[PDB]
Amino acid sequence: DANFRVLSQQLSRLNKTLAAGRPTINHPTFVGSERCRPGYTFTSITLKPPKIDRGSYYGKRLLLPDSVTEYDKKLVSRLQIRVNPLPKFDSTVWVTVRKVPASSDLSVAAISAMFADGASPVLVYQYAASGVQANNKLLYDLSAMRADIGDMRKYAVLVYSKDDALETDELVLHVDIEHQRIPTSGVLPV
Amino acid sequence: ADANFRVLSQQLSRLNKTLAAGRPTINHPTFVGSERCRPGYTFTSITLKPPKIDRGSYYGKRLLLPDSVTEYDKKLVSRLQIRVNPLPKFDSTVWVTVRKVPASSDLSVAAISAMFADGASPVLVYQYAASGVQANNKLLYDLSAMRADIGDMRKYAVLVYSKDDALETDELVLHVDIEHQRIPTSGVLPV
Amino acid sequence: ADANFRVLSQQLSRLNKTLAAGRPTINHPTFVGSERCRPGYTFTSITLKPPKIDRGSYYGKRLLLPDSVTEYDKKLVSRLQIRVNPLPKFDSTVWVTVRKVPASSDLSVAAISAMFADGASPVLVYQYAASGVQANNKLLYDLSAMRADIGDMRKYAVLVYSKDDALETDELVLHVDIEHQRIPTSGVLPV
Amino acid sequence: DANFRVLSQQLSRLNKTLAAGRPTINHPTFVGSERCRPGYTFTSITLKPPKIDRGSYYGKRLLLPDSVTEYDKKLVSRLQIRVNPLPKFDSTVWVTVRKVPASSDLSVAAISAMFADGASPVLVYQYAASGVQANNKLLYDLSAMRADIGDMRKYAVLVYSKDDALETDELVLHVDIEHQRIPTSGVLPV
Amino acid sequence: ADANFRVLSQQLSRLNKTLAAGRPTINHPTFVGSERCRPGYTFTSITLKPPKIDRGSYYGKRLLLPDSVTEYDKKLVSRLQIRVNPLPKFDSTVWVTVRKVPASSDLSVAAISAMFADGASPVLVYQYAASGVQANNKLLYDLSAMRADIGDMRKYAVLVYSKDDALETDELVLHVDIEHQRIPTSGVLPV
Amino acid sequence: ERCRPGYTFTSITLKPPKIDRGSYYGKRLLLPDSVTEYDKKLVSRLQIRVNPLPKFDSTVWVTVRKVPASSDLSVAAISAMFADGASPVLVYQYAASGVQANNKLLYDLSAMRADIGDMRKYAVLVYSKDDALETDELVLHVDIEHQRIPTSGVLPV
Amino acid sequence: ERCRPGYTFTSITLKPPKIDRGSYYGKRLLLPDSVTEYDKKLVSRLQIRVNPLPKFDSTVWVTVRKVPASSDLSVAAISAMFADGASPVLVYQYAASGVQANNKLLYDLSAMRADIGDMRKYAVLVYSKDDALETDELVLHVDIEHQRIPTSGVLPV
Amino acid sequence: ERCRPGYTFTSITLKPPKIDRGSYYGKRLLLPDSVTEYDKKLVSRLQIRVNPLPKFDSTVWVTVRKVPASSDLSVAAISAMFADGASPVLVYQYAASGVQANNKLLYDLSAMRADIGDMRKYAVLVYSKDDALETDELVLHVDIEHQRIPTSGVLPV
Amino acid sequence: ERCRPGYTFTSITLKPPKIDRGSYYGKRLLLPDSVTEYDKKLVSRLQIRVNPLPKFDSTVWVTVRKVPASSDLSVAAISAMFADGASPVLVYQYAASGVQANNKLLYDLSAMRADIGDMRKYAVLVYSKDDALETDELVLHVDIEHQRIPTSGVLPV
Question: Could you tell me what this protein does (chains F, G, H, I)?
Fold first, then answer.
């Protein structure tokens, strides 16, 4: 119905705001995420970091599955990082995702520099005496730069441990790469 | 009923809902509310009072409806809520979920803990608090779009891991309400 | 649907019914049929396997629905059928009925036998036969027009008198189906 | 012809009633059976029970032919049991069909319990001094519960002998399973 | 003839038939009736007086029409009735049927008795009674929809098993009427 | 290959017995009662198909023939039968999938309007050539296309 | 060959273990969770495909079968299985491109409406014949056509 | 392959005699009187077909040729005949069903309007190569497509 | 087979060097400058074709693969490559015209929109099996379908 569509679109933006950052009955522990860019879908990569020494950091390239990497020219819109903790977890970690050149562009300095430079999004997961931090994730949009499944090898996740020394098993990060849909063929194989 | 308006209302309700948030009520003062049933669906519940759970060990249990339902197994199960109620003496913290667990085609130890990290099924974290019982004690696992039926529930399980103390015998009591299409009432006395 | 005709049909059905008589069916080969429920009514059944009944003594038992029903006691009970099924080894003959039996404001002996003569409540006479089990094994006691409710059933009782032999333990098994207005299903998952 | 269709449908119900339970010139010994649920057909399984001891019972799962069991998702509407006796027969048997869980749900008690519980249909075939019992069969409808060829493995026929001890050959039960039609293909094989 | 009515009549006849049941008549006082021929069909009969049948043994005989018919073998046989008439001295009980019996491609002993259990062909059970001769003495085996012809009858057989006594020589006499399309009469004297 | 409308195949499976080198074996085709019951139904084409069981190791010769003299047996008489080049034969020798393009062959009585009844007149014939066909070496199948047999509209009595 | 609309193949790859001469080996088909998650989805046709690795040097026999007695194992029990000529088999022996026209074969449950759930009921069976299948001799594939599994409309939580 | 309208094949069957290693044998085609009677009827294509009898064990060479010098016999003269690569030949050596894709070959006089009369001008030629074709080793057939011969409208006199 | 509109094949010819028994050899595909110049042009399907030179006498195995670790060489590393059953292979062993129906095989990047630029990422791999591929034994060809490269509208400067 004409123009009311506006008041109602406005009305929604509002609802979503009030809604946002809140867990729901279907996900009573962690905050929710987002609808996908139409035409896009996402491929996830999970990864359990080894121990991360106190004050040190773990890094790791986004290495997608061959099933997908072959369709390398498909566009990546955004990559989301999710920190889910295991029950034994009790530390503080700082996290981001960023294009990281094998130019070998230093280590530790630029790791910690990447947290302050305001270049990429920062998450801060910390053990809550009170519970489990509902806010477990960051959604980084590289849409602007037409990136594709190809360049995902160029990016990496960084995880700086602050006071513990992230022991093996407390945390399992997941990298979900939203990109354009890859077809499902119709042909009996070779 | 007048569409241009008829939609404003629609939006307004949603605002209400979100605001209503997960707040208890004068009708249910301690725990938060729950959801209204998918039309034509109703639900049958299962209560399960688990044995001591050791410090940091688990507990599982297959969902198994009473015979009377399982008879009508071709019936669609739409969502399947778990709900943890504490008894006065509760004092530990637990992490709970439900998921399909393929009889031994699955590993039965810490793999379980991992079900909490894989983010494969909804996780609820009931923690005892100094100032009162947690009002957040429910988890709604929607199976709606995978077409499952009363038949399948046997396949699913609730898992309760104990975190910093050994959950004893009468600290907790869980329920498993299983939403499913309505079972017919029969309009003819027995023979 | 055309009234002048619309009534002929009505008559014809009745003829059918009466002819159908109390004849078993390929669907129920041994025992006779039963009746279709009063609209909006359904029924909850009670099974009762009575202890040895001595030669010429009785047996009684108050109707008592499971909690789940008795909760909705303001609900009208319309009729209340009894039905006796014999087990292979049955060999005695019994006389059974149901009626309101006012807790001790009633005599509890042969007064009972008299309930069979006063013609105050329906009497069923199940007799073991040489050539087969009796197909006549049901008795429909209509309480329809006295307005009774789930609440009252406590007040009623089934009475089984044994005639020429002592009814043993596993010769008979009776059921008490109690027709009553429909109990609501609730359209909101638990809390 | 409009509305007369009623008086005539009524008229039929009547005829069928008077008719029912009576053998005919085409089957002068046993009562007849029924028309099939449109779209359905039936597969039969015959079975000659071994001796059934006095006061004991024989049970047996409905095990259909592979030709059929492969089309396991087809719907079963009802199963009929038929007791045809051999000339040497002279006993009393009690019969039913019922979903029987390999939970191993007891034996003899629940066998005999199944006759009284009013759960499933009971037939009572007994030697007639006068002749052969015309009423040789029971028609059990499980339509209500959408059962299919698959679940037929779950059901079993029970046969309790009452005074003889059903000797081998006096009786041959037949289980005719009505289910949905299974297609007959049009293709020269492989 | 007026369709709405024209169908009521149709129903009424059926009622009559079913009621007429299998009752003898003043026209045939002892035995029950039989059926009217499929149009354009007539029937040729075969009489067969079987030799002593031992106690619990059988008797069979291929249907074989006289030459005069067998000549027109491409003629459809529609049904084929058997009918057992007892003679004063009858006193035993017999079980009889007819079915295709593939020359020795079939077993010729108790397999026969089994033809009574396989429920493959109609079974008739003629039993001598103290108060009179059984009025039920006919069995109509319809072959209508398998397209069979006078040619095939050779292939079929009547089987008579004796139950509690040895059927002697002149206790019984059976007939085999074989319904078949009408054979032409020829409108030209011989040469 | 889509069989004719209103027709469907009906398959006889034969597991031949042992057969010594250069010996022979026959067997009359005998369809199920469910089928033979409607003897007047039309038969159309009909083929054999050989399936090698693991351990197959021979050179079989197979056919289907109208063996007459109205039940004139099938002894090492079936020899002359083979010898006259009267009926077509499938010659099985390979088993590598697809090498000996054959485990199929034919006949098509369609136009001489034959029925399920005459089928019983034919018989399968096998001849070993060297190995002497062992047991459990292969499974034979003779598929018979024919009009569709009608379902009953009512349950059994 | 263009697979049905709304359907797509899903391929299980099996690298059999060593197999001694005339021995056997099985393995139940187990599709990915992404797939098995939607267990009620319809399965249609399904084929095997053999790819010889350099050094292939045997005569393999392969199949896919509904191995029942609800998890009745797959030991040298799979032998009788092969022996009954019950399921069709692909017999691999050549590897010269195109000689043994086969490294493909079938089944088509389309019309008995089977789903991803029952797939788990079947199992691959292999039998070596002489050489005794070494390791790294060939790679087996069992392709399973079935309705398309739906993508999520929202990112993970 | 559907033969032309108003045409139908007519088949001559030849069972060659014994033939020693590297020897030869011929035989003129001679259709039935019913056919040759209408000598002016048009002949179109024509093929040979070899059927191995059990015990076949040779490498036969076969053809059909216009053997002229108006009845110039068919002795080991038919040799040069073969030797000139003049007419096309079918070379039979296998018998496993479908391996040697051949037991068929050709000629198509359609357009040089030949009739049943000239058929008699051609002859079958066979050449053994090693084994020396035994007797009862194979059966030869030469099919001759040609216009349909007319039925009589009246009974015999 | 008519290649897509606006596309045309471009063929790389490789004459492999000597290759000892059970050894291996690779070579990256490198199209002509005329082609690689327009690096952004779409590549579609691509096949190998083997031509036996007189004197061919081996059993070659051939493929085309995306050999990565960005120029990770092609030594007897190409072995594991072959060993993983990752890319499809043409197996050449016959040379009688048409026996080993193969001297052709595939890949079809059409839908993953690949261009002349990525071609350079792939490499040919060969493996001998017995003989030890001599020199001048066969000639390899890898044909690459792709959009048509534009002609210049003006003469050189």
Answer: Capsid protein. Probably binds RNA and plays a role in packaging.
